[PDB]
Structures are given as C-alpha cells and as structure tokens.
C-alpha cells in the first residue's frame, strides 16, 4: 500500500452522525433530569419562606 | 381526641396522630402502634414532610379536621399546656420537653389540629418546638429552630 491507515479511516459521514446522536441522546436526558432535580429544590426552599 | 401511642419493649417512645383521612407517624421513632387495625396499613417512608398512608376503611374516617389558613397568633391548645405563637412555637415551661413525647398534635380552640411536634428538647430558659405546619396556602412546611434535637 502506498498510503497509510489511520484510526478514523473507515468512519463515514452517515456513521459519524449516528455516534453523535446517541452521545447527544444521553446528554439530553441527563441534563433534563438534573435541571428538574434542582428546580423542585428551589420551590421546596421557597415553600418555607 | 384520639391519639394512639407507639409501643417498643413495653415503654412508650412516640405518639401517632390521626387527621381526616390520613394517619400520621414520626419517622424518628421505631415500634408498633397499639391499634391492630393500624398495623395492617402500609406506611411508606418519605422526606422531612412526613408523608404516610391513610389506608383506613370508611367506618371511622375524619376523626379531627386539620386547621386551615388565616392563622392568628393568639391562644392555642396543647396536651401539656398552652402555646401562643404562630410564626414560632411558644416557650413552654419544663416538664414537657423530655423524651418520647413526639407526635403529639397541637389543637386550636375549635378542636382543629394545627401542628405536630418533632423536636426541641431544651434550649435554656426558653424552649422552642420544631413542628410542621402549613405556611400560607396549605402547602406542608417544616419549621426547625436552631439546636433542635429529636424529641
């Protein structure tokens, strides 16, 4: 072979979109509940006074 | 009023109060209620707001009514005496404030329960009670003064 092989040689554009959606699917659900966990703690702090 | 206590190894270490529809019990005490009808209830643990289950049948519900809004700071009824504070609890004298007196309700002049004691053993010459109540719109809140050991 005249060329050289790298780590990202076989990764296509359609395959790179799947691993950036599945990574983004977990990051969307994690920050949805993490915001909502601190939202009700603000109401529970504001409920007393 | 009807207030069934909690038995553990022959001594009484807590009290369980009954309001309209629901049955109250402090989390800090361990033991079995003397009412065998109340032992079959599936009481569930919760946060500091002390949520339990009123799974009692129809024949004895609404023993007493919980006190609504528009709270004055005047006279209030208590089992060992009287309390006269709305934002806080009154500096009741000694005798009351020992051990195993948790769960006793605080009633009004019409027999309506306003608060349930949980702590505040002794804070010098003035003793403050850590109770739960409703602040403005019926939302259950928990007020705790400084240095309130579980009583």
From Swiss-Prot, chain B:
Function: Forms an icosahedral capsid with a T=4 symmetry composed of 240 copies of the capsid protein surrounded by a lipid membrane through which penetrate 80 spikes composed of trimers of E1-E2 heterodimers. The capsid protein binds to the viral RNA genome at a site adjacent to a ribosome binding site for viral genome translation following genome release. Possesses a protease activity that results in its autocatalytic cleavage from the nascent structural protein.
Domain note: The very N-terminus plays a role in the particle assembly process. The N-terminus also contains a nuclear localization signal and a supraphysiological nuclear export signal (supraNES), which is an unusually strong NES that mediates host CRM1 binding in the absence of RanGTP and thus can bind CRM1, not only in the nucleus, but also in the cytoplasm. The C-terminus functions as a protease during translation to cleave itself from the translating structural polyprotein.
Domain Peptidase S3, chain residue ranges per copy: 2-151
Site feature (Involved in dimerization of the capsid protein) residues: 76, 109
Compartments, record wording: Virion; Host cytoplasm; Host cell membrane; Host nucleus
Quaternary state and interactors: Part of a tetrameric complex composed of host CRM1, host importin alpha/beta dimer and the viral capsid; this complex blocks the receptor-mediated transport through the nuclear pore. Interacts with host phosphatase PPP1CA; this interaction dephosphorylates the capsid protein, which increases its ability to bind to the viral genome. Interacts with host karyopherin KPNA4; this interaction allows the nuclear import of the viral capsid protein. Interacts with spike glycoprotein E2. Interacts with host IRAK1; the interaction leads to inhibition of IRAK1-dependent signaling.
Lineage of origin: Viruses, Riboviria, Orthornavirae, Kitrinoviricota, Alsuviricetes
Domain of life: Viruses
Organism, scientific name: Eastern equine encephalitis virus (strain Florida 91-469)
Name the UniProt record assigns to this protein: Capsid protein
Entry comment on modification after translation: Phosphorylated on serine and threonine residues.
Phosphothreonine, modified sites: 3
Active-site positions on this chain: 28, 50, 102
């Amino acid at each position: 072979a005249q060329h050289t092989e790298s780590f990202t040689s076989a990764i296509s554009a359609t395959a790179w979109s799947w691993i950036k959606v599945l990574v983004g699917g977990t990051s969307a659900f994690i920050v949805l509940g993490l915001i909502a966990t601190a939202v009700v703690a603000l109401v529970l702090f504001f409920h007393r006074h | 009023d009807k207030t069934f206590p909690i038995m553990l190894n022959g001594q009484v270490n807590g009290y369980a109060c009954v309001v309209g529809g629901r049955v109250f019990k402090p989390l800090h005490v361990e033991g079995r209620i003397d009412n065998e009808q109340l032992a079959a209830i599936k009481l569930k643990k919760a946060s500091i707001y002390d949520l339990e289950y009123g799974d009692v049948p129809q024949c004895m519900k609404s023993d007493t009514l919980q006190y609504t809004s528009d709270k004055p700071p005047g006279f209030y009824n208590w089992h060992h005496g009287a309390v006269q504070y709305e934002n806080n609890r009154f500096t009741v004298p000694r005798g009351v404030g020992g051990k195993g007196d948790s769960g006793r309700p605080i009633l009004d002049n019409k027999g309506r329960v306003v608060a349930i004691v949980l702590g505040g053993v002794n804070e010098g010459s003035r003793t403050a009670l850590s109770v739960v109540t409703w602040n403005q719109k019926g939302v259950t809140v928990k007020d705790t003064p400084e240095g309130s050991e579980p009583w």
